[PDB]
């Protein structure tokens, strides 16, 4: 029945994107295809073909392990081709960017449950891009993958992407301990200001900025970020002073940015025109 899948891996490919619901209609096809593809027949699966095509809206929605049976049907090249085609369509679903990103990621798990990990593995990068498509799977399932690549190997970059997602997953202290461990390796340079910022340990970032702000003149960032501590520190006078002290260096950027904090600063001390 590979010819069917071959025809379906064609029909599933269909017009990727062109536009969005069509990429989904490509899936809706691919679904109904996979349905009519009958899977391995597996007549029970084959039974669903018309049934899922009856309507069958949520039934037609899954269809989840349909492709599994098909992906379990080998033609591994054709599979890979389809997988690539899928992966391409999944890049097109990364370009979708929404719907399959839900569904395909779902098809990831079930496969990833099946062992079954076979397709495109690791592929985790775009897996993260789907997990960068939207949000919570794009956290929960993502953090998994995120950690998971992190298990293939650590990088501060991972950590950067990583401890972030904890709070993107609202898991605050997990983020910290990572750093806490990461401290024990990664890394001095790794900008713990940005971290402490993302940690919202402001005092630590303060000197951290101060440290780097000792090093050079300011990245508008650093002044901001350092003073972003102070406002988060609640600290005014410095925050007051420094933007008052340095208002000159400001880019219109730094201007627009700091002016806020600056507004916040002088207001903080109940100067007005200063802020104003």
């Amino acid at each position: 029945m590979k010819k069917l899948h071959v025809s379906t891996i064609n029909l599933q490919k269909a017009w990727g994107a062109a536009r969005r619901v069509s990429k989904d209609d490509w899936l809706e096809w691919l679904r109904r295809l996979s349905l009519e593809l009958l899977k391995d027949s597996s007549s029970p699966s084959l039974r669903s073909c018309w049934a899922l095509a009856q309507a069958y809206n949520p039934m037609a929605r899954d269809l989840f392990n349909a492709a599994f049976v098909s992906c379990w049907s080998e033609l591994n090249e054709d599979q890979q081709d389809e997988l690539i085609r899928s992966i391409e369509l999944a890049l097109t679903s990364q370009d979708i960017a929404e719907v399959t990103q839900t569904l395909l990621n779902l098809a990831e798990f079930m496969e990833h449950s099946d062992k079954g990990p076979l397709p495109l593995r690791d592929d985790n990068g775009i897996v993260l891009l789907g997990e960068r498509a939207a949000k919570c799977r794009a956290y929960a399932k993502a953090l998994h993958y995120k950690e998971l690549e992190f298990q293939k190997g650590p990088t501060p970059a991972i950590l950067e992407s990583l401890i972030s997602i904890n709070n993107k997953l609202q898991q605050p202290e997990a983020a910290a301990g990572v750093l806490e461990y990461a401290m024990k390796h990664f890394g001095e340079l790794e900008i713990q200001a940005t971290w402490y910022e993302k940690l919202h340990e402001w005092e630590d970032a303060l000197v951290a900025y101060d440290k780097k702000m000792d090093t050079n003149k300011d990245d508008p960032e650093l002044m901001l970020g350092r003073m972003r501590c102070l406002e988060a520190l609640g600290e005014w006078g410095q925050l007051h002073q420094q933007c008052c002290e340095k208002w000159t260096l400001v880019n219109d950027e730094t201007q627009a940015k700091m002016a806020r904090m600056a507004a916040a600063a002088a207001w903080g001390l109940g100067q007005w025109d200063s802020m104003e």
Binding site: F150, E173, A175, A176, G177, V178, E180, Y181
Partner: peptide
């Protein structure tokens, strides 16, 4: 636990 789940919630917990 989570990756090096020692230092994370755990010890903090």
């Amino acid at each position: 636990m989570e990756v090096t789940g020692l230092d994370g919630n755990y010890r903090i917990t």
